[PDB]
Design a protein around this ligand. Structure first.
Ligand SMILES: CC(C)(C)[C@H](NC(=O)C(F)(F)F)C(=O)N1C[C@H]2[C@@H]([C@H]1C(=O)N[C@H](C#N)C[C@@H]1CCNC1=O)C2(C)C
Ligand SMILES: CC(C)(C)[C@H](NC(=O)C(F)(F)F)C(=O)N1C[C@H]2[C@@H]([C@H]1C(=O)N[C@H](C#N)C[C@@H]1CCNC1=O)C2(C)C
Lengths: 302, 302
């Protein structure tokens, strides 16, 4: 038992991380087969980052302007192109540690692991969720662009996120691996702001089930509610509305604990209207929404 | 910016994880050079686990009672011995992925990453602290014994923990890699209980500095206190007393923020006596004590 914010083991991704330098800008790249993927703003100076014209900037570069290092070994760039907000660098050597992989775009509410890297070197791994406003609450410093987010499915790495920038509220924005931003952001140093965020209700319910599985039961009650009555109060507290598909997704956890979904919604309703009043749930004094139903099953079942 | 519970990248450890079977008991082992380390209770049946005599149990086994699998490959056991609570299995093949490593015993208050494994297969990575009562608040299911805890120093993996068992409060106990338990526990299925835990004060102060570095300043005040006046109130709230060496250790964070240690102790004193009153710090409504000063510097500096 126990319950922790758990990341996927990162070894399969560590073998793909490289350093990419162009000019005096160094950031991280992802080396799969004979292609290195990295944020396109590697081709920018500080002058360019306020209003870059990336088409112009790219035609002014040649292959030998790109310095790619995989640890000690230099990789020779033999071709480049830009796909939306990423650069694709063709190199002369295919990465022998290329895992089975795919590129997937995730949805708000889903979680993934982040391998934070600097100068091509992995520094740390942590779990986060894609927020409803398409930002992530990460931990990133200068030089972290090109760090990637991923899930592991069986033997297969699904890459879902490449880091680009930090917004002024201290949250983070990036693209999928095809270079398309999550959310309404652009890779230029202008005034951009995230929209208002909401709490991911299905995830909160999943975490309440994790609590019951681990013996925290004080918030339960014998009441029940309906989907519409619950959604009515949830709107008022900036919670995402709950769908029948969410109820279905919580099925395995309902079965394991013998507590029906709409039963646990009535518990959540009371916690929203009355607070915790100084008690905790799984060691937290706030309602946690960055564990999916799948995360909970994976950790509380295996 | 941002602040997350961050684990070390696990790749260097993933390459050392093997599956160890003896009888119908399967658990994890650590394969370094030509030795596999695993919990000695792998040699137990369910009968034996209530009152094992491990000397007797071990002499009744031969090398061929031990099935060791590194993924697909079988390793041939050519010798065994017991060192305190671990078993050392000599195998015919040295692990070619052996990293530079050392065995270190950590102190209460220090943090490390855990690579949770089942059947020799890495499942997840998370950060935890060794509590003052020598337990860890982990997340472990049946089959997880032999999972290891580690820090990475430069190119060198320091192994500090091997998982053995869960106590009845749902916390976890294990040994260093020389087989010596942390805390007053034994590897038999008897009634054992952890002593009372306390809050790790130097870590709470480190986390308050992380908060200031990230722009959370509401809890600051212009007051100051002395080490003895602070320690006097901390005792009453089950906080570890603060030493001059702790003050020294917080130096880099004091310098970076321009807020003296004893200055921030006065802030902590007020938070203990008055609570948060519904505000949060770095997204938490409770005082967090599982980040060391080094963790904070590492994440808020690099
Ligand atoms: C003001 C700030 C935080 C420097 C800027 N932010 C915005 O202009 C805002 F609009 F998003 F607010 C921004 O992040 N960048 C500007 C420039 C890089 C991108 C950038 O410096 N990347 C960093 C890299 N490697 C990662 C950043 C640094 C702090 N922590 C991170 O995650 C471009 C091409 C977008
Ligand atoms: C009651 C319980 C939790 C099964 C027992 N606990 C105690 O007897 C207590 F005294 F600690 F309370 C215990 O853990 N074990 C008994 C047996 C194993 C050790 C054991 O089953 N290991 C597991 C393995 N692989 C890891 C455990 C399972 C749940 N989560 C973990 O971490 C020995 C040789 C100590």
């Amino acid at each position: 038992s126990g319950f922790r914010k758990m990341a996927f083991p990162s070894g399969k991704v560590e073998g793909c991380m490289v350093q990419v330098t162009c000019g005096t800008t160094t950031l991280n790249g992802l080396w799969l087969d004979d292609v290195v993927y990295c944020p396109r703003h590697v081709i920018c100076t500080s002058e360019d980052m306020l209003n870059p014209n990336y088409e112009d900037l790219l035609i002014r570069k040649s292959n030998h302007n790109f310095l790619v290092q995989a640890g000690n070994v230099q990789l020779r760039v033999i071709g480049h192109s830009m796909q939306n907000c990423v650069l694709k660098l063709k190199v002369d050597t295919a990465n022998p540690k290329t895992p089975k992989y795919k590129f997937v775009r995730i949805q708000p509410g889903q979680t993934f692991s982040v391998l934070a890297c600097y100068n091509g070197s992995p520094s740390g791994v942590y779990q986060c969720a894609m927020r409803p406003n398409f930002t992530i609450k990460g931990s990133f410093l200068n030089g972290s662009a090109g760090s990637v987010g991923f899930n592991i499915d069986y033997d297969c790495v699904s890459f879902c996120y490449m880091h680009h920038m930090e917004l002024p509220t201290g949250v983070h924005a990036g693209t999928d691996l095809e270079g398309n931003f999550y959310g309404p952001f652009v890779d230029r140093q202008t005034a951009q702001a995230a929209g208002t965020d909401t709490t991911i209700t299905v995830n909160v319910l999943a975490w309440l089930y994790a609590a019951v599985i681990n013996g925290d039961r004080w918030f339960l009650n014998r009441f029940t509610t309906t989907l519409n009555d619950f959604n009515l109060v949830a709107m008022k507290y900036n919670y995402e509305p709950l769908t029948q598909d969410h109820v279905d997704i919580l099925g395995p956890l309902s079965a394991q604990t013998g507590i029906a979904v709409l039963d646990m919604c009535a518990s959540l309703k009371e916690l929203l209207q009355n607070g915790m009043n100084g008690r905790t749930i799984l060691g937290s004094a706030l309602l946690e929404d960055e564990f999916t139903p799948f995360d909970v099953v994976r950790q509380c079942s295996g």
